[PDB]
Amino acid sequence: AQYEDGKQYTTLEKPVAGAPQVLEFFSFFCPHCYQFEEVLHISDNVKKKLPEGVKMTKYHVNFMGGDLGKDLTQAWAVAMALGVEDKVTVPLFEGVQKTQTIRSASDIRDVFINAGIKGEEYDAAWNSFVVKSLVAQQEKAAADVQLRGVPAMFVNGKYQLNPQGMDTSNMDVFVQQYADTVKYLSEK
Template sequence: MKKIWLALAGMILAFSASAAQITDGKEYTTLDKPVAGEPQVLEFFSFYCPHCYQFEEVLHVSDTVKKKLPEGTKMTKYHVEFLGPLGKDLTQAWAVAMALGVEDQITAPMFEAVQKTQTVQTVADIRQVFVNAGVKGEDYDAAWNSFVVKSLVAQQEKAAADLQLQGVPAMFVNGKYQLNPQGMDTSNMDAFVQQYADTVKQLVEKK
């Protein structure tokens, strides 16, 4: 009897494992031309993008992905410049945030200012969001035209071009795979977020 139960338990575990497997063309797609040298997990977004706001501030997809990543896996987030009148300036501002290590500090207030209160209308308004979030104005100014920030802007632009980015939000793994949210179950948002994060984890571990 014990052997039978163990066999049944093994079958159930095997079924559970197979049910969670991901499929190329469904939860993700393999890029025609893999891009070497990209971050392990790379997310593209725009502060102008309503879906990016939902992903970040409502569904907390990025946070869930980070928590599920294998230890030591690096996750990077790049801003795109092709949306909105200040898209290029916001990409540079995001480079400032990366250079100063204040990405988490800036994300929510910048989304709020761009999409909700619509108080970001000029480059000066972008700077003010940083200051209001606790970043010293002189630190922001020093970083704005620095070599480091210019390099980070170039990195963001090059990655978007190399990966032939078509829209945001978008997430890539190892420069080989792109997540495909349309192939996931969106009937339950909590389940969707978990499936999205699980897919990223499996792609990171994929050989």
């Protein structure tokens, strides 16, 4: 066939019921994730090709960057709760990987302040139980699928994107293949 299990995707042995339709995992410490976000705009091109009625979820993971990695999962929970993902994603990536000016939770906080979220508002979110459960959700979703690597995308808790099995000669063609695969799996 044109799309083959073990080629553009793998199938989970252990399917995850009640899973978000399109579930993406990343780390601000993850170098291909940086590419996926700022050079390839994967999430965005997937959304563009996805049918309607489909929600996309994106979660941060703990297994990279030790203590700062965990702070970043909590900060992403704050981002999701305040709905400011599109304002902090790029500066968090560049602060961690490009400029290396993120070294502590206070530095993560500075990125939000500079993006215009208020101190009070950020610190209140940071400490809120709503953020606690949001962090739990990120962890549970990663735990559900045995996740030891990012970037990663899962469709309907049963299929996992396999970018290694796509051509990377051309970044544009790579992105479309990736997105067409998500759409194919979506319709499955």
